[PDB]
């Protein structure tokens, strides 16, 4: 009864699909086998004795499709911009999405920056500091997430639902 359109932005391999499947089905490919695609989902959540229903829109992350994205994020009440903490190039890309939504998305959009694959230790290349700093400077919140271990998956969607104008 609060109906939200939520877009997932970020480049291929970041973990947009893994994130939303953890959130929706509570599965990760390595533990449960694959059942359904992850491009579109409806999900309801209880927030503060109310109800918030998410329509979740995946987008193609490849460079050649970048200029298509505004058609997807048009009228989005919220966005999760995902990056892979082990890929510095994914982080750079996530900041451009933020900049773009600020030039060209809704000012009352709740953006969340998700730093995915937190569970990967010897691979990590992006600091909590930079992500956190970046998000603090640009009016959005940063969370570290993991689809595999489930860390901060439910919570990032909860925190988005909480902040809904």
């Amino acid at each position: 009864s609060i109906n939200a359109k939520l877009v997932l932005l970020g480049d291929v391999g970041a973990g947009k699909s893994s994130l939303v499947l953890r959130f929706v089905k509570d599965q990760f490919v390595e533990f449960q086998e694959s059942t359904i695609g992850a491009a579109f989902f409806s999900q309801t959540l209880a927030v503060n004795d109310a109800t918030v229903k998410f329509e979740i829109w995946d987008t193609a992350g490849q460079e050649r499709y970048h200029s298509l994205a505004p058609m997807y994020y048009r009228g989005a009440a919220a966005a999760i911009i995902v990056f892979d903490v082990t890929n510095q190039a994914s982080f750079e890309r996530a900041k451009k999405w933020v900049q773009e939504l600020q030039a060209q998305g809704n000012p009352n959009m709740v953006m969340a920056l998700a730093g995915n694959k937190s569970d990967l230790l010897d691979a990590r290349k992006v600091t909590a500091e930079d992500a956190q700093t970046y998000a603090q400077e640009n009016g959005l919140f940063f969370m570290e997430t993991s689809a595999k271990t489930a860390t901060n998956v439910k919570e990032i969607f909860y925190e988005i639902a909480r902040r809904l104008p």
Partner: protein, 246 residues
């Protein structure tokens, strides 16, 4: 609807069709008039003292029935009905009939792990059925079937190559390929017509998501150049020439 109780519903729908010619064709107004007529007849289905025993699904079917009847009458005045839509159609057809001859899945970032060996033939065929129907619903259903088929085929590829579930990153590039290979006639007018004339209460949810996918596919395809399908400018232009000769 032929039953004698429905006499005055029938008169009403028909005085609408006759009263539609009374204005010079204009898409933005025309479709506004039809959506309002739909909004109003549909209000008259549920609220009607005779139709107060109907299930939600039955009232929804009657909506689609009205849509179909009305849109079939209005079809030639409202569909691809001016020069600029005709021109955009032909530009899209031209580009696809050329590009379909040399495009490969790697031009669109389709990974070998998500390859289908029919080249998603059944999804191509579902899409090409689009000009077999006149109602926006049945046109949209072709798009939606195409999408479902693509998704089931992608899921199969992921199972086989032990990959994670497909998302927009896998789906959209495959919708683009499939659309190019299908080259469905009057794709631009077909989409505009669905957008305008489909019962607006129904262009929502998953339906609207996959619709937005095909609209973004149309847009990508219109704008295909060497750089957008990752080919050298000389390789691209030379591929286009050989396509024209066939």
């Amino acid at each position: 609807m032929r039953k004698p109780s429905a006499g005055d519903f029938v008169k009403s729908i028909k005085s609408f069709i006759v009263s539609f010619s009374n204005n010079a064709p204009d898409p933005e107004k025309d479709c506004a008039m039809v959506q309002e007529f739909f909004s109003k007849m549909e209000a008259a289905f549920r609220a009607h003292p005779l139709w107060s025993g109907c299930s939600e699904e039955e009232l929804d079917s009657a909506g689609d029935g009205l849509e179909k009847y009305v849109m079939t009458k209005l079809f030639t005045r409202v569909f691809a009905s001016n020069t600029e839509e005709v021109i955009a159609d032909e530009k899209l057809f031209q580009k696809m009939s050329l590009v379909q001859q040399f495009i490969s899945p790697e031009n669109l970032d389709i990974q070998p792990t998500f390859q289908n060996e029919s080249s998603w033939l059944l999804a191509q065929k579902e899409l090409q059925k689009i000009n077999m129907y006149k109602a926006p619903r049945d046109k949209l259903v072709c798009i939606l079937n195409c999408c479902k088929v693509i998704n089931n085929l992608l899921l199969n590829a992921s199972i086989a190559s032990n990959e994670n579930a497909p998302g927009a990153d896998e789906f959209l590039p495959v919708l683009i390929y499939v659309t190019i290979k299908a080259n469905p006639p009057q794709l631009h007018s077909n989409l505009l017509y669905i957008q305008r004339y489909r019962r607006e209460s129904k262009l929502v949810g998953e339906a609207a998501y996959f619709f937005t996918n095909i609209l973004s596919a149309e847009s990508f395809i219109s704008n295909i150049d060497a750089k957008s399908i990752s080919l050298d400018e000389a390789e691209f232009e030379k591929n286009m020439e050989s396509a024209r000769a066939r």
